[PDB]
Design a protein around this ligand. Structure first.
Ligand SMILES: Nc1nc2c(ncn2[C@@H]2O[C@H](COP(=O)(O)OP(=O)(O)O)[C@@H](O)[C@H]2O)c(=O)[nH]1
Ligand SMILES: Nc1nc2c(ncn2[C@@H]2O[C@H](COP(=O)(O)OP(=O)(O)O)[C@@H](O)[C@H]2O)c(=O)[nH]1
Ligand code: ALF
Ligand code: ALF
Ligand SMILES: [Mg+2]
Ligand SMILES: [Mg+2]
Ligand SMILES: [Mg+2]
Ligand SMILES: [Mg+2]
Lengths: 394, 394
């Protein structure tokens, strides 16, 4: 891995675990040319297949322009788009979390700021375990000093559902600890009315909707805070979504106009979003990896069981059914006469035990046989404990 | 309500209940001019704000063209779009289920087919209870003889999650009973490659992805069946998504090309998708409302508790916690010595009771105080039963 390429910072394994590259990425942060500079860490997350990597590449152009001339540019109109791997169509491209393997070094107050870029696998891909992508997105949220939440078309149930999940991934991910959040709405319906004042009005209206709900207290906090802003990009047009070199000349003109404005605002805000540690001191490059490591271990400790809404519905109902059957067993035991002889008692209890296993299987919901078996096995061990204790003391 | 207007067939009330219009809609189906004709029932469902009503209006043009001349047309290029109420932007428009208040009468085998159109509130709107919209979409699915599942951009976790839910809303909604399903992908990334052969290839690839999963057996069944097809529409362009009259001339040319092809295929298939009853006989107009009524009562009987993924996660964990605490109480009672005097026993049990209520509140997850109180109240009644039984028998 040579300089000026993306490198994979985080990947997930089979067991659902998140692993950091403790060699190449770790070495990227500790380079003595810039390890003591204050850092700005830009991360992008959001739904799959919506130009996240594409956008990070145009930000990279502006950072490289600023690194050279102190000047803001998105390149020449015929420059094809390079950087983080980006690709058209329905197949997903980014997996895990990638970073550019060198910072971009911007002038700031007679020193430098080291700017790091993190590109995350998009959500809603069914070939990826949804909890795994949730953990990846929360790790990006945690480490960011500027987080881009890339949203398709408009804020909907899905985006609010997911960002509420992200901000519940430990106290570290709560909205108060999120330094800066851009809610970037891609493919905005209005190609002419997308400016800063439209976006404030749109968020104010969303807050009205959220104030009526119970579901999204953490997102609501964030949206009401001075740490969250919304930007709107119109649709880029068919010269960008099909087979494309990603060139500025391929862009719909209103998309290019909003893109230039948005990228320029990101770059110009960098000096106001230097990454901070727990205590609020400026964080340097040399301490980012430590933070990544500790919070990755936090995320790998807890298994949530996020799944399809129907699977979680069946899980609630089936867990209620198991508890009902256990209580049924307990009530049956309490109702037995202490004057029954021990051998006759043992038979009666065993028959009830078998009858309740059959009842579980008669009322269990869903069709995942493997999970029915796990649940049945678990019910069986718990009833056996109850039986043993009763028949030994009886 | 006069003829040639939309009328609301189904609405939801505060208590989450679905109500049918038993007067106007009921009278629409039983009109003696067409109540004995076989019916075709087209229903559209899917995510909010994605041109569902808009599409149903262009289908209406083609039906009205066919009703008049036996000829297929989408109108003149400058005709503004009328019919079901449709509107740009982020605010939702269709609520409940609407129908056109007259059938369109198509020639068929020396008789007529009565064509009914049902337009459904889109999913993912946070001002609507998600279970309520799920029930509305399942009712549309149940009654359809041609169902349009309108999908934004591509099949993702969300669409598969929701259609799996729809097809679990009673045996009536299972994939085997779904006469015909179009998965209509709007805003398809490729403006040139969207034809029937691309869509088959796309679905075949999705089936490969689903074959690896446990989550979507019912969708998988449907996609593998001969009763489900996929059609792709490119993006209509900014002359349709902004302030628009919805005219053919406002359309991107590749969108208009796919739209004409798709609408023509829908209308030409009508004779092959006559609605059928349980036994497979042709259903007439005069019996549609009966079916609507019976299945609406089925849907109003069951309350699922669908909610945000974080809320369902907390619900699973909190329900497990309540069961753990109840078992803790039961084990404590079993471990008590029968030689303890009754008054001393009653105090010991009461103190454990209080200690376990405190434990519940110490470990309960989430921040919905109202639901914590409900759960605490419920735990308290169950422990009281256990206590009463123990202290009376002791
Ligand atoms: N619909 C849409 N597509 C975009 C946008 N920006 C870029 N694209 C295209 O989206 C496709 C996926 O881009 P990519 O960056 O790989 O998506 P990612 O999975 O979000 O990282 C490419 O064909 C891009 O050119 C946008 O604003 N809207
Ligand atoms: N992005 C997109 N917008 C569309 C399409 N077709 C129509 N629209 C626009 O979407 C907006 C919402 O249309 P509407 O029919 O009310 O949406 P509905 O809530 O799905 O019924 C209107 O401005 C339409 O002109 C499409 O294929 N893609
Ligand atoms: F779908 Al992606 F990066 F979110 F390829
Ligand atoms: F958002 Al809609 F009909 F689905 F207005
Ligand atoms: Mg990407
Ligand atoms: Mg912070
Ligand atoms: Mg509508
Ligand atoms: Mg059927």
């Amino acid at each position: 891995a040579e300089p000026d390429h993306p490198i994979q910072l985080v990947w997930t394994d089979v067991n659902g675990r998140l692993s950091l590259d403790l060699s190449g990425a770790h070495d990227c942060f500790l380079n003595t040319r810039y390890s003591n500079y204050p850092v700005f860490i830009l991360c992008i997350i959001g739904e799959k297949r919506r130009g996240k990597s594409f956008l990070m590449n145009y930000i990279m152009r502006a950072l490289r322009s600023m690194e050279m001339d102190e000047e803001i540019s998105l390149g020449a109109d015929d420059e094809p788009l390079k950087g983080f791997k980006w690709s058209p169509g329905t197949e997903t491209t980014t997996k895990g979390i990638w970073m550019w393997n060198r910072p971009f070094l911007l002038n700031h107050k007679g020193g430098k700021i080291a700017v790091f870029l993190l590109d995350t696998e998009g959500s809603l891909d069914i070939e990826s375990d949804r909890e795994t992508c949730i953990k990846l997105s929360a790790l990006s949220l945690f480490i960011s000093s500027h987080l881009i939440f890339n949203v398709a078309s408009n804020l909907k149930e899905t985006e609010l559902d997911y960002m509420e999940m992200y901000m519940n991934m430990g106290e570290e991910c709560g909205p108060k600890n999120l330094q800066h959040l851009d809610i970037l709405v891609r493919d905005w319906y209005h190609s002419k009315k997308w400016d800063r004042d439209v976006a404030r009005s749109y968020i104010s209206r969303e807050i009205e909707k959220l104030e009526k709900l119970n579901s999204y207290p953490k997102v609501l906090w964030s949206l009401k805070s001075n740490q969250t802003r919304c930007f709107l990009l119109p649709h880029p047009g068919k010269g960008i979504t099909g087979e494309s070199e990603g060139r500025l000349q391929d862009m719909d003109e209103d998309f290019q106009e909003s893109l230039r404005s948005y990228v320029s605002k990101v770059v110009k805000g960098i000096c106001t979003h230097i990454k901070t540690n727990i205590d609020g001191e400026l964080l340097t490059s040399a301490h980012v990896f430590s933070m990544l490591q500790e919070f990755t271990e936090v995320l790998n400790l807890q298994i949530y069981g996020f799944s399809s809404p129907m699977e979680m519905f069946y899980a609630i109902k089936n867990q209620k059914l198991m508890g009902e059957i256990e209580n049924e067993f307990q009530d049956f035991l309490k109702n037995q006469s202490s004057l029954t002889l021990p051998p006759t008692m043992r038979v009666k209890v065993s028959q009830k035990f078998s009858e309740l296993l059959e009842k579980f299987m008669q009322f269990v919901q869903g069709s995942n046989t493997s999970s029915h078996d796990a649940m049945l096995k678990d019910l069986e061990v718990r009833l056996l404990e109850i039986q043993e204790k009763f028949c030994n003391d009886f």
